[PDB]
């Protein structure tokens, strides 16, 4: 659910928190954590390659299974854990042989549910199987681009991929952006839609909330100096120029896609 926080003090007036009562409260599964280092937006050369990244609360990486390499084993969910590394929630599934792994929690998955990934993989929300055995027209998430790569499509919150047609050894997919893409049928994916979809309704209420998520304030170019930004500045607020990126690349319309290698896998762009 979504709760609008009462305006007890300025800065909490517009806060709209997202509450998940069934989300587990407590420490995660210790063996499935890895050390995460904040880069701060700096590469190995130490320069800020991408801006507005720095600070924020410390986070521990969760090993989320995207490949589903081991197949044909019944699985049961145990708990849902908050994952700071991604918008979507994660679920801790215990295999019938005693192995615990992390998977992306779909919308229809709650506590005390049973999933089955295998060659048969009866069509239920949460099952994992290749596209050759998935009916055309179902909501599918955690889609792959290559066989065995593991979960490279529709990983965010409330996102899904719809299958429109097969037409041979490939499969045509309607991506969430609105673009038709062709992938080989050997790619493995999961049925159902991904979990919590009310991620829009949270608005963070204040500047400080965005500060501890790792986002630094952004300086608009029109308030900068000509030596710093192409927009620069004059006496008062003056623009007089076409909007461009700080590196002199025209913005608001100029397409920057130049691949010429994956174009054959695309039959229709977004709109």
């Amino acid at each position: 659910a979504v709760v609008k926080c009462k305006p007890t003090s300025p800065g909490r007036r517009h806060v709209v928190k997202v509450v998940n009562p069934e989300l587990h409260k407590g420490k995660p599964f210790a063996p499935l954590l890895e050390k995460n280092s904040k880069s701060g937006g700096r590469n190995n050369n130490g320069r800020i390659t991408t801006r507005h990244i720095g600070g924020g609360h410390k986070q521990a990486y969760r090993i989320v299974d995207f490949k589903r390499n081991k197949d044909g084993i019944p699985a049961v969910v145990e708990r849902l854990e908050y994952d700071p590394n991604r918008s979507a929630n994660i679920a801790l599934v215990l295999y019938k042989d005693g192995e615990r792994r992390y998977i992306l929690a779909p919308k229809g998955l709650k506590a005390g549910d049973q999933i089955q990934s295998g060659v048969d993989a009866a069509i239920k929300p949460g099952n994992t199987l290749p596209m050759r055995n998935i009916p055309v027209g179902s909501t599918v998430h955690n889609v792959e681009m290559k066989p065995g790569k593991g979960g490279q499509l529709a990983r965010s919150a409330g996102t899904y991929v719809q299958i429109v047609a097969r037409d041979g050894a490939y499969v045509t997919l309607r991506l969430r952006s609105g673009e038709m893409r062709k992938v080989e049928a050997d790619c493995r994916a999961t049925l159902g839609e991904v979990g919590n979809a009310e991620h829009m309704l949270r608005v963070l209420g204040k500047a400080g909330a965005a500060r501890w998520r790792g986002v630094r304030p952004t300086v608009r170019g029109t308030a900068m100096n000509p030596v710093d930004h192409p927009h620069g500045g004059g006496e008062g607020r003056n623009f007089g120029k076409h909007p461009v990126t700080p590196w002199g690349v025209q913005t608001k319309g100029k397409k920057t896609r130049s691949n010429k290698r994956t174009d054959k896998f695309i039959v229709r762009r977004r709109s």
Binding site: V119, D120, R132, N133, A169
Partner: protein, 149 residues
């Protein structure tokens, strides 16, 4: 260049001829795996006498290849049971690896790269005919039987 052919490759030579063939075809096809040898004014006379013995010994290995082609026809059918569903829908698929593994475990060993399956994909239960590549001019047909399990 002036490469000299040494096999029964497609119609651009007559088992030894100085032709005007671009280096793209000559390399990566003729130099790595038989069928020819570059002629740089030194192998032209060396291989002239070599036509007597290697060509003669090459004319008998092809007879042995036909013998394996005739020997493998002792069954004319190979049965493989694989998981499948209704309306002839197969959960998995069968390729050159499975056919080669089935034949090797049954009779004379065969290479999976020798399987000529252009069209090519096994998706239905029943009878299927697959051709082989025992020679550039000789082909063998074997009927495979996939059964839903």
């Amino acid at each position: 260049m002036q490469v000299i052919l040494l096999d029964k490759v497609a119609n651009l030579g007559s088992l030894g001829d100085q032709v005007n063939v671009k280096a793209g075809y000559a390399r990566n096809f003729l130099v790595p795996q038989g069928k020819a040898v570059p002629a740089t004014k030194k192998n032209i006379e060396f291989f002239e006498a070599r036509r007597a013995e290697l060509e003669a010994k090459l004319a008998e290995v092809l007879a042995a290849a036909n013998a394996r082609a005739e020997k493998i026809n002792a069954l004319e059918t190979v049965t493989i049971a694989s998981k499948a569903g209704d309306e002839g829908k197969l959960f998995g698929s069968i390729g050159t690896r499975d056919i080669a593994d089935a034949v090797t475990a049954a009779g004379v060993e065969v290479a999976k790269s020798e399987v000529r399956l252009p069209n090519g994909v096994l998706r239905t239960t029943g009878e299927h005919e697959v051709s082989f590549q025992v020679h550039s001019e000789v082909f063998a047909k074997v009927i495979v039987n996939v059964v839903a399990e």
